[PDB]
Amino acid sequence: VDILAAGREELMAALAEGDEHAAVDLAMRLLDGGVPADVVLLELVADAQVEIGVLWQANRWSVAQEHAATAISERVIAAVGDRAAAAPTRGHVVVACLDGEWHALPARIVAEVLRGRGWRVTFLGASVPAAHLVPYLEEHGPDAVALSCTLPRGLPRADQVVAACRATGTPVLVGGLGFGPDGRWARVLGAGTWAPTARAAADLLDRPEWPPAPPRPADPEYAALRARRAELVDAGLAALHEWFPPLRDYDARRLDATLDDLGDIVDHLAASVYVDDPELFGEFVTWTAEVLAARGVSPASVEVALEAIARVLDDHPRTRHHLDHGRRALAAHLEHH
Ligand code: B12
Ligand SMILES: C=CC1=C(C)/C(=C/c2[nH]c(/C=C3N=C(/C=C4\NC(=O)C(C)=C4C=C)C(C)=C\3CCC(=O)O)c(CCC(=O)O)c2C)NC1=O
């Protein structure tokens, strides 16, 4: 009687169909049967969300489905979290998404698991500016701040926000997909203490030791990518005009989508360079190829843009390595698909 495997399928069906009654009731029945709340949130809800991500990437997930499924998940997490909340005896943890980060569900799961272990949690929500977060810490003096980052493109900003929080004397936890496999990009930056899940985060806070770091060498190549972003986007676009025939026939909507995506390409290259890990840019490029291909856009367009960006930045040595690796990963992806 693998109740978890059965539950996983039932929840996914409810989310995909927008059935809020079935989803919330399933969560309540699991708790009725003594299934731990952190199991419901991590092995069921989080897992269903991963699969939704896969459907979305493959262009099999509508706007209407996003709203319905996210709203239901908010309700599930709220009901489970409140039900399993323990007496707030241990202290106070502030939880926040980075500025420009709208993936609040992972952070809310962290918040609820912590409540379930006796922490008072203030959840400051999605996209919290440091200008708001830092004063909050200085006057409330929580035992810890937990910063969530899901998008690797947010890593440079993460590094800044972490440092600003540390300057308050507040111990910093970090997590989310944005810090990469095994938190490798958290470790590169020496950013707070990373943990893979809410359960692991709570376990960290049970350690008796309870887990101003100078090393931050100037990165001029990173700064050049920020400063020259529009130039690089334009070079991308010009190369696509020349060498990517379908672009000539694009309406305004499609030119705008192209410009947005070119901007993201530059931003992910910047993040890659910032943490000195071309694998960031590599995995981003091959992911982009799948995203575009599933929407009828030839991923050969990406090679045209990357090659053009590479010409402009050919005298930027680290950056041209990142670009080489991206284009190489793309080529291998397109041969091997
Ligand atoms: C739902 C969703 C959205 C929702 C989020 C709504 C909300 N309230 O959260 C909305 C619709 C807003 C959205 C928008 C976008 N998203 Co989205 N989406 C997702 C999705 C499907 C699930 C998110 C989720 O619930 N995760 C919950 C579970 C799965 O997360 P988890 O990692 O197990 O959580 C644990 C750890 O992260 C850890 N943790 C997290 N934070 C912290 C903090 C601390 C301190 C600690 C210790 C631990 C910790 O603990 C958690 C709990 O155990 C994911 C797919 C995915 N794989 O995550 C994408 C995904 C993250 N989204 C993606 C994208 C691209 C987007 C958009 C850019 C798309 C667009 N619109 O152009 C935007 C960007 C918004 C932004 N600026 O942030 C991509 C990103 C890939 C990339 N980096 O390039 C993903 C991976 C989907 C995909 N397969 O392509 N998204
Ligand atoms: C280099 C050449 C290049 C071209 C020519 C390009 C074109 C391009 N991308 C599109 C959509 C898209 N492109 C993306 C890609 C992303 N969304 C994200 O959040 C992130 C980070 C990415 C990846 C970079 C998505 C998600 C869509 C569909 C979503 C939408 O715009 O509604 C579309 C519209 C598809 C359609 O509806 O007809 C076009 C024409 N993108 C390129 O990168």
UniProtKB/TrEMBL annotation:
One of its GO terms (biological process) is tetrahydrofolate metabolic process. PANTHER family: METHIONINE SYNTHASE (PTHR45833). It comes from Saccharothrix syringae (Nocardiopsis syringae). Cob(II)alamin 2 binds at residues 100, 102-105, 148, 198, 287. It comes from the Bacteria. Cob(II)alamin 1 binds at residues 49, 74, 100, 102-105, 148, 198, 268. Residues 90-211 form the B12-binding domain. This is Cobalamin-binding protein. InterPro entries: Cbl-bd_cap, Cobalamin-bd, Cobalamin-bd_sf, Met_Synthase/Corrinoid, Meth_synthase_dom. One of its GO terms (molecular function) is methionine synthase activity.
